[PDB]
Structure formats: C-alpha cells, structure tokens
Amino acid sequence: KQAMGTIGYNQRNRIDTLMYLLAYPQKPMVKTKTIELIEFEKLPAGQNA
Amino acid sequence: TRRPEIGDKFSSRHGQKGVCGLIVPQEDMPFCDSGICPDIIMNPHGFPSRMTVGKLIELLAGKAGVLDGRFHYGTAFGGSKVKDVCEDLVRHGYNYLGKDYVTSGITGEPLEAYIYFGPVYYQKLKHMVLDKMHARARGPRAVLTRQPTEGRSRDGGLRLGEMERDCLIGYGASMLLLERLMISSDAFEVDVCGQCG
Amino acid sequence: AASQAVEEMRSRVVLGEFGVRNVHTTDFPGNYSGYDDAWDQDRFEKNFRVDVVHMDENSLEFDMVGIDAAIANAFRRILLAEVPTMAVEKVLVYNNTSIVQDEILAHRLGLIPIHADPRLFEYRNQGDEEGTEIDTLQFRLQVRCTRNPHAAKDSSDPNELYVNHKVYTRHMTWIPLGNQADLFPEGTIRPVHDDILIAQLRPGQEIDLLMHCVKGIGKDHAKFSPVATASYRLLPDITLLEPVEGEAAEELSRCFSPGVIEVQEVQGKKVARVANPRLDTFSREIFRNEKLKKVVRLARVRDHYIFSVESTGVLPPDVLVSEAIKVLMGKCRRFLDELDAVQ
Amino acid sequence: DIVERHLIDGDVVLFNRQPSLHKLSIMAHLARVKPHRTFRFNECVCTPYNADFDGDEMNLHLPQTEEAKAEALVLMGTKANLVTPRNGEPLIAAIQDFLTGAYLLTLKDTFFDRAKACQIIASILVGKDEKIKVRLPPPTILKPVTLWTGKQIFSVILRPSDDNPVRANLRTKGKQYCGKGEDLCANDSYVTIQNSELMSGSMDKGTLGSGSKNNIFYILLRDWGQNEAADAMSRLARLAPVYLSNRGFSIGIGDVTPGQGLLKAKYELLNAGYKKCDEYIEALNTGKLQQQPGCTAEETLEALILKELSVIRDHAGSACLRELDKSNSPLTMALCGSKGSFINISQM
Amino acid sequence: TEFFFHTMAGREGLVDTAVKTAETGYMQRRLVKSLEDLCSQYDLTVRSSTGDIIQFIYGGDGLDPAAMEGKDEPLEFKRVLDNIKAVFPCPSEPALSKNELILTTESIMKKSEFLCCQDSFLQEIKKFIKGVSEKIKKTRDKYGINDNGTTEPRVLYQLDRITPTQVEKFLETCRDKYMRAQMEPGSAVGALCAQSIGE
Amino acid sequence: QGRFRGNLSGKRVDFSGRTVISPDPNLRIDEVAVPVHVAKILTFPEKVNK
Amino acid sequence: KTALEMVQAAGTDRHCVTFVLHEEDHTLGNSLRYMIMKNPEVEFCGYTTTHPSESKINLRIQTRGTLPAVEPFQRGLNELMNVCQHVLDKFEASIKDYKDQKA
Amino acid sequence: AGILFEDIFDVKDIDPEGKKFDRVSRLHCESESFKMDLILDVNIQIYPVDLGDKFRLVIASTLYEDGTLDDGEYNPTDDRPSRADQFEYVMYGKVYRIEGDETSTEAATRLSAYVSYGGLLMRLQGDANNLHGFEVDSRVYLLMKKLA
Amino acid sequence: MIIPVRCFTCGKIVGNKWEAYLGLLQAEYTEGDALDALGLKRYCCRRMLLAHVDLIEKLLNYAPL
RNA sequence: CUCGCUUCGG
C-alpha cells in the first residue's frame, strides 16, 4: 500500500501535496493473475534486482 | 531527485521490509562465473523464523523466466510448479536450484558454499531517512507551557515520556533527570514571597 | 595416497554436492612439509603464460596460467574501478521543455560512454568548474521537435507525423576547446554507440544543453567504468574416475554442457570422454544422477584463470588490460616512493 | 566564556528507543561522527533496545551539564549495564550472523593455513587494538600440512596479546549435547575453555547468545571486569563477519526441499493418523468411546484427535531432520540457535 | 482451507499482541507510580519516602539481583573453584588431604576480614569445603593415595589436586564477590522492581 | 494530555534528535555513530578553562 | 602522508609494525599481502579495513627474528612491481602475436 | 628423550556414531603391548586411515630428540633434525584433563588423559603406570606413523 | 518512464537496444530468441529489456504539445 | 496558532 511507483498516465500534469515516483519502474517477473486483471503491470511500483 | 542511501527502507513484496545498511563498491561484491554481481545482498537469517518459502520460489521462477524470456505466474493456490522451473534452469545450463558457484570479490577466492542468485522484485518504500532525520536546537517554544513544540514540521523536540523518566529513576541518575526535565526544557526563575507564600 | 591428497589440496578446487573444498590458496613457505613454497622469481617467470583465445572489438578472452588468485582479483578490480575514462559530469541546461526531468536527463547523459581517449587528458583540479582545454570536453545537444510539414492525413505512427521526436545520442556535437580541434582528427571525439535513446519529444518541446566531460575513475562513480563486465573464472578440469560407457555415457553427455563431453564408438559401443572442459559452466547436474555421482570428479585448476573482458567501447580491451597493469605498477611505485621519502 | 561547540567524538550521549519497557531501553553511549545520515551502533546492543533495523526510529539526547554527562557515562554506560537487573542474565551478547559465524568457525571441520588464519586474526586489529602484538598461536597440525584449527582462531579473540591478563575458564553443555559424552560427545557439544583457549565444543547461542548465564562474555564480565567483556564483544563483532563473508553462507530452495524418505514417511504417517482418527470418530458416533477422566466424550475425542495430529507432525519432523544432510543452512541456523528452530524447519 | 485456517491463527496472534501492549502499559504505569519512592538506605534498610521501613534488609540478605551469578545464589562455588584451579595451577606445591584442607579453611576463615561477612555465606562456604574434602578423601581411598606425599605414581596426585595457595585465592575471591554483590546504598530498588515485573 | 502527565511528569526537551537506525559492526558496543548533519545542530556548552 | 608506519607500542619495536595506507582498498592490500606472505621471514602479515566509509587500510607485519619489518614491506612492493612488469610484457607479446597470426 | 608415551595401536572402529565430519574422524584404538584404549580425533583428508590399520603413536614433551625443551615458539620454516622426521602425522596440543576411572568402585588403577589438539580430542585410558609424566596444562606433541 | 541507458547490475549498454528490440517484436520473433539475437547473454540485461515498461509515449500523450 | 479528525510508521 506504501510502495513507491507510478500513479497514472497524467501524473505529470497532476499537482498533489506529496507525490512519489520511480525513475525506471519495471513490471514484476513473477506476476499473479490478479496483477493482469487489475493491469498493475501497466503502472509498476518496483524494480527487479 | 533522491538516490537510495543508508536508512532508505526497502521491501521485497513478501513482508521482508529492510533498511539499506551498507553500500559497497561493485568490485567488493561477489561475482559468479558469468560476471554477474548482485544489486541486493539480503541476509539468509530472515528466512527460518518467518518461513517465507514463497520468496525462494519467486526467486527461482524469476531466474527461469528471465533465462527463457517468459513471465512465470505466482498465482495463489496454483502458479508455475518448482519442477518446471528447475527443468528450465537445467536446460539453460544453470544449476537446477539457483545455487551458483561464486568467487569472493574481496579475497578473489571461491566461496565454500554455493550462493542463491536470482532476480527479485524489490520495491522502495516512501519512508526515507532524509525526511525522517530530525535534530533540535533550543528552537521555538509553546506559549501556554514554555516547552518545545511537538512535531518535526514545527521544529519540535523529542519527548521524555513517563517510562523514560521511570528508567532514569531506576538508574538513580538524579542530576541528569533534573537537567533533562528542568534545565533543558522549561527552566524558569520566579519570585516567591516568604511571608505570604 | 597422502601425497595425492596434498597435491589435490594445493592444486585443485573440488566442487562437492553441498559445498566447495580447498578454496584457500595455501602454497606459502612453511605451510607444507615436502614443498619449498618460498618466492622464486625465476620459477614464476618460467611457469607463467598468457594465451588469447578470442578477441574482437569490445570483447577479449584470455587464459593466464601461473598467477595467483590475489593478483587476478587485483587486476579485475583495477579494470572495474581504477581505470580512468571520459564521461559527462556537468550539464548546463538552456530551456529544457522535455517531459524527462532535468536531473533524470543529466543522469542519463552522464551514463553515455565517450570515445575520447582518457590518456590524453588530465584530472580536473579541485574546483575549477570552468575547465581548461587540457582537462575537459564540451558536447552541444540542441534538438527542437516540430511537426513534419509533409505527412499523410492519418499518420498514426509518430515517425511520419514528427521530426526529431527521438533525441538519439548522434545529435551530440563535439565543441572543440582551444587546440583540441587540431590534436583530435574529426570523428575521433564522439559518443561511442551513436544510437542510445536519450529522450523522447513532442512538437514544441526543445532540449538545448551543453555537457562538460572530465576524467574520472570507476571507483568515484560507476559511469566511469570502462568495462561492461571484467571477470575471471578458474579453468575446469572434469575427470572420470572410472571408464563410463553405454547409454550412461550419453547420460553423461546430457548432464554437463553440450560441448564438453563427447561420446565415441571405439568398438561400436559408446564411451564418453572429456573433450573441451573449458566450455563447462558447472551446472552440477551430474549430482542428480545417483549412479553417476561417484564416477566423476568436478574440479577447477587453481592457477588457471580465464579472463573475460567485455568493454563499453571507449577503447579496445587489450589497452584496458595494459592500463590496469600499469595502474597497479603505479600504485606500487607511489608507495615505494613514499617509503623512500620516509627513510 | 561558554562556547557552544558541535557534538564531537567522545561526547556522552543518551540513546533511547521510545517504547520503553525496562531501564536498559535507554543507555549512554560515546558519540562518533560519521558522514551518513543514520544512527549506527553495534548490533550486539540490539537486544536491550529491541530494535530490528526495519525502519525503527530512535531518539538521541545530549546532556548539557558536566554532572549530567558524568552520571550518564558512569551509571548508564553500555559496559556498565551488560546484565539485566531482572535476573542478572547478560542482555548485550552476540546475535544472528554472529552466533552462526562463530559456530561455523569453531566447528571441527575448519582448518586454516597460515595466510587465511593471519587474515582472519588481522581483521580485529583496529582501534584500541592497533597497539598490541598479534600472538599467533602455534599450529595444531604441522607435519603433513601446517593447519590452524578454527577454535584457536576463536580463542585468539579472548586473549589476543601476550600481556593480556585475561584467563577465561568455562565448562558447560551445548544445545545438541548427547548427555553421556561428558566432553566426549559425538556431536562435540560440550564447551570447555581453559585459560582463554577453546579446548572443546562449538560456539552457539547457549554460550555466545544473550539467553542466560554460562555465557563466555558473562564469565569475562564477572571475572575480569567490564572492559575485557566489551573488548571481546568488539573483537567478535569484527572477526565473525569477516570469516562468514569469506566462507559464504546461503540458503536456497533446495535447502528446504523434502527427500524421498521424508515423503514416504509422511504419506505412511498421514494414512495411519487418518485411519486412527476415523476409528475414534466411529467409536464416538456409534457406540461407546472410552471417556477420558475429567472431560466429556466430545472433549475426549478432541484430545485424541489433537494427539494423533501432533504424532503425525512430530514424526514427520523427526523424519525430515534425520534425512536432512549437514551444511543445510536452516539446519545449521537451528543447531547454533541463531534463528529459527527444529519446529520451523519441520513446518516449512 | 489450510491457508484460511493459518490466516486465522496469524490474526489471533496479531490481535493478542495488540491488546497485550495496552494492558501491560497500564500495569507498568501503575507499578512504577506506586513503587518509585523506595530507596536502599545506608543502614541496609529499605525505607519509604516518609521514613517508614518496608524491609530491615533488602531481599532478606542484601544482595544485588544484577550481580546475582547463580540461580538466585550469589556464587556457583564449583565454577569459582575450577576457575581458581585453572588460573593459578601451582605446580611446585603438594596437594592437600581432607584434614589439611579442613584445617587450612578453618584457619583462613577466622581472619578479621571474614567477620563482617554474613554468617549464611560462611556456612555455605564451609559446606562446599566439606563436600570437596569428602570428594578428595573418596578419590584417595579409591586409588590408595597416601597423604604423606610419597605415592609412586605422581599422576595420581593430579586426580583431585588442591593447594593452599588455591584455597586462599578461592576464599578471597568468594569473599570479594560477596562484598561486591551487595546493594549499593541509594539504589532505586522500587523502580527496579517495578520495571523487572512489568517488562 | 493534562499538566501532570503531559507537561510535568513527562515533557518535551530540546537538544535532542530522532533518526532511523542502521547496523554498524565496526563500532564498539559503547559507541554510537552520529550523522554529521545532526552533530552540527546538537551543541554542547563547553566552559573555557586553562 | 599516504603510508605511515606505527610501531607495536611506545617501546618502538621493529619486529611488529602496522603500515597505514591511504586511499587504498582490498586491491593493493590483498596483492601485497600475497606477495609479502611468501617471504620466509614474516611470521604474520594481515590487512584490514578500518571502516568502509573511509578509504584506508592497515597492514600488519610481524617478522621472525630481528628484521625491521620495513625491509619485508619494501621487498614485497618490489616483487609485486617486477611481477606486474613481467605479466605486462608477456600479455603484450601474446596480444601482438595473436594479432599477427590472425592476419 | 622427552617421550612421555609410546605404543603400537590397532584401530577397532572408525566412526561408531556416524560420518559426523567431512575432514575429522573419531578413531577408536586398542594397544597390543598393553590394554591402553585410545579415543582420537584425526584429520583423514590429509592422513587417511582404515579400519584394519596399525600405527605407532608417540606422545612427546618436546619435538627435539636431544632433550632441548625450548618451545617458546615454533618456526615451520626452520629446518633441523627433529623427531617429526621419523613420523608422518604430527599434532600439537595440551593435556587439559586427568580423570580417574569411576566404573571400578574400589581398588581402581585406571586413569584417563584428555588432550585437546585445538578441539581435536584424545582420551588415552589405561593403567596409571603408563601415564607417568602426564600433567594438566602441559603441552605435548602427538606423532603417528602407519605400519605395514 | 524510459528505458535505462545502462544495465543496473553488470553495466552493459542497453539503452540503444530498446527500439530495435521492438522491431523484433514488430517482426515474428519471440521474446527469448529476440533477446538472444540482440546479444544479451547474461540474464540481467534480459531482465532489463524484458521487464521494462515504455511509459514515455503514454506520458507524452498527456504532454502540452 | 489552537483544536479535533483521519492515514501512516514502529
């Protein structure tokens, strides 16, 4: 719930009181079907290390 | 623009929240035969108490998937089994359990035990040491009771709670307790009439 | 016997099912009874050799025989960190309208390798942000994206609609300082890869900036590292304790790397033998076969290091190895000079 | 004149974790300034603060009086509060990755040549230990090959120099002691230290951890003062990580995979337990079930079913522990007691 | 189903911890607010803030729980004796017989410095010395060792070897440990008790 | 939040800081590493003597 | 100011010395340790890093007899330099004749 | 001669309680001249032994046959005529325990010497006459040579 | 947002191999064989290209222009 | 600023 990552496609025009973005987000290598259903891979919030 | 540093909180999608304790140079990192040096070295000791076998299976599946260019599924009560990813790993020339022969970066000698290598989806948390770091000089005080304010946003000082006072009492340090609770917080000089009180 | 065990301990690194054994270098004076492991320069010069096995541009592979683990690791670490290169440090921005943030853009520009030879420059002094002809380079990046005046009515693809919508690193133009134009022939100073995607634009957006590149070592920052991957591995030597024939020999050929174990029909029956032990990666799949566990003995030769050096294209890897050796020599010379000054 | 100087090295500073349970939750340390942005301290002091480095924030007070500073240094010095007042047990002791490293170091398998032993010993020669002669112990095996055992290297920590007056002596039982060997246990689990030399046994939580007495650091504190104990802790915290990193200690998915014997035993145990549970169910439902004293028939059935399930679980755990091989990292971490237990291994 | 049951157990643990934190916090506050007044005076009597006596001697004996080496006993005599033997092995002195050990222990104990020590500790020391003397006698009877010091196999003298120097060192060490294990007057006994119970 | 519990028995103080912690085994058990930024803020009044 | 010697104690015994090397790391430390351990007159050689934050290493040399422990240090440095020169020459020859046989 | 003990032993068991350690094994041995039982931990990786092996074992106070007990420090690089030249497996340890036999309740003559070569344990048990010269906190050398 | 220039672990130049990779996906190539043809041997660069999401064009759809 | 409310962190 507190993971850092992209918010949406309009995250640049949006002006919020506090916003956290990741420079190079990557979709997970091991993805649940729930990730596909909610289209989480379109807005990843982490990196594979 | 912030770069990860000491104190930055890191998670591993399995409840293994951690703090970046040390940032070593690349050459000091251990390397495999292929020349791959890890980005994150995580302590094995976190596993036995928490029994997060899911992290190990995720690491193995991710290694197999990146080797064969696929996206394995970790779906609840299902997903890719261990046998298939082991077969993929052995087909690709790696060990069937992820453990790889590793040479120590420091001494230049091989390690006695095989090391568990693989890609893990680590996510950075909003808790940063830069935002949380706080230091308080004399600073401002509150009008009602002339004591330092509460929060970091208001440049407040830390609070000696009741239990801190209890611990100081248990130590018997009378002078330090007096200095902390009287001299350094709300010392004042009043004028008392010795006749009327 | 005992002598064979001692020789294996001091010459071979054996890989067991659960762990590696004999990993420590032990040939030191007084460590062994029947061996005089005192330093002998003549013996080392006799035994040592270098054999290049594969060398193309931005890739080198060579076996070093007779050296120890400490010196090989020192060479690897010097190649990784202590070899100076040319890379971007300062970015002066004039009207960056791009979506890519200024700090992110500067970080991306810094990671771009530069084909300039580092030996011809010097380290910029502390401070001196202006930079002089000797110790800096300047690169101008000016890309203005605009709509294509001639395009199809639909033109769904951005390539037809727009021009300069992808800021490739070929747009970087070297700006000579002082007499650098005469010293360096045209085309020598340039980004190495010429195709790195720096940023992406839309019409109206513009990127105008100047880049100051200064000499640096990979220890200070990873953008200065010349080698993509500089590593070494001990040369494997798989040995067969007993002759393996029949279909189990084919199983042997399937347990190891495809090209290391070869099966031959000496008398019409397949018998396996070690063909090219170098090609093995030690997947250790022979341990799964219960019967074949006790017939092979996987090992690494202690004093045989195959170095693989894949460079980023700044300069050919052979010059990189020469520079690494010279840097180690320079460290030794610096400390010898300090010791002489002390005494 | 009063000069409001910056906090420099050597200043006595109070250090506290805000949820305070006992008096050791707040201690006075000596400040050393470092370029990074976090409060850093030796991990052996994690147990009193109950800190875990998972984002926990700690408070730091600076006394503004000489009397307060002296009171903090004397009464609340870390060297002066190595034992909790509740029962006198040592709280500041070795923790995970120190118990494991020392246990692997002091195992009977370890054998070092001169170079590796010299490196491991020289790992400790920093700070106040820069002004001492090393006193490399004589090698144990010397004719075929000159080898130093791991126990000698560990005992170097207790008494590094010739002039060190520390002579630690201890005789206790380890976690995996058979109970009959009496310093000749097959597992080599009887710890015997004579004159700051490890004669037998392997280090573990029972002797190096913060559990209770018989701790070697506790013996040092009670026999030779606080300074020797603190120096031993620092030497251990500097030596064990070096050896553990140079040796390599990893856990993999195959370290927790089950063997064929475990699978067969688990299948047989599950079948037998389910058959017995079905027999008990049939006995209660149709007919008379032998009622245990002090409880009803349904509670008796619940107790019997719980007993059978526990039988299945513990026999499966015994089978998995028996079929497990050595150098298995979960098993190693369970044996030395650094983290986990046999129950966790059986469950996972 | 198994996952659901496991999650049930985990949530039970979590809520248990959540309630426990608050309950013990309140109990700790009450205990400290009640017990904080007491102080170990210089006459070894624990007194309240008003001067009333709660205990004539703390813990009945007057020993510090923080320096309590044994299982609520100030010393483990066997460990102390073994440490004394190992630290000071006197190779140039003969071993002691049962009668000799008892005589030298009785001679040393009657010195002035042992008078201020508590009688119970002296009785425990006497009991331990009697036990070790009985052990020495049993060993020498088993192996026919002669107290004259002329038994031919000298290794037999290494079985239960004790020397008067070791006895003096052991007695002085025990007396010093007992003296340094007493409550230092002025200690906040009540707060220590409150915290050591609440935690 | 009353005077007795919030401002008399336990009260806020200055000359204090609060930071995330990270391990450091190279320090003695009686030492703590303080960031340079915090040390520049937390001051100690030293009296000038001979 | 880079390499500083520090004797075993205030007595200034030359048998046990510690050389503090500045802006150095495990590269030179490990290579020099290997090259100086092969000297028969060195009882104990060992390097350590004081702290990962600061770039300095402490080498410790303890000899057998009455060697000043600076002579083994200089000898090890010279041997390492000679080894580096020899390997440079051999590697250059290998590269050159590999190129020649390629064409 | 500083030879404290010397006898020919025959191995009766290699690992009665399992293959515990990869490099170290717990030999059980019986003497021929006397009834001296020996429990000895050895490094089989460098000096392998078998069940039927017979070896000469010598426990010596000093490693020099001339009787010079000057053992302040040992130099492996030093070359000089020593006792170790006659043997194959030399270990260095301390006799850290002397324990009387408790199985015999009365009239017992058996003793046991526990020597710890850096954690490698040796219990030499038998008649107290043969153990003459053994003392606690005394450092000894074990020399082992396999016979035909 | 955009493809990183360098691989995180090893450091091989991977920024210039992105668009060509897309071409191999615009062609009939699978993921694995396209990565093999691009020359990414070790799995870290394969993870770099395979797990990267191209958010730059989606963000540019919201650019001022 | 005061106050309350939520969401966090631990």
Ligand SMILES: Nc1ncnc2c1ncn2[C@@H]1O[C@H](COP(=O)(O)OP(=O)(O)OP(=O)(O)O)C[C@H]1O
């Ligand atoms: N409400 C609270 N009161 C006091 N301390 C707390 C509170 N919440 C968190 N903490 C701090 O966090 C620590 C709790 O961690 P603990 O419960 O031991 O592990 P955990 O959170 O169960 O982690 P695992 O789930 O076991 O991985 C101990 C305590 O100092």
Ligand SMILES: [Mg+2]
């Ligand atoms: Mg925590």
Ligand SMILES: [Zn+2]
């Ligand atoms: Zn008045």
Ligand SMILES: [Zn+2]
């Ligand atoms: Zn890569």
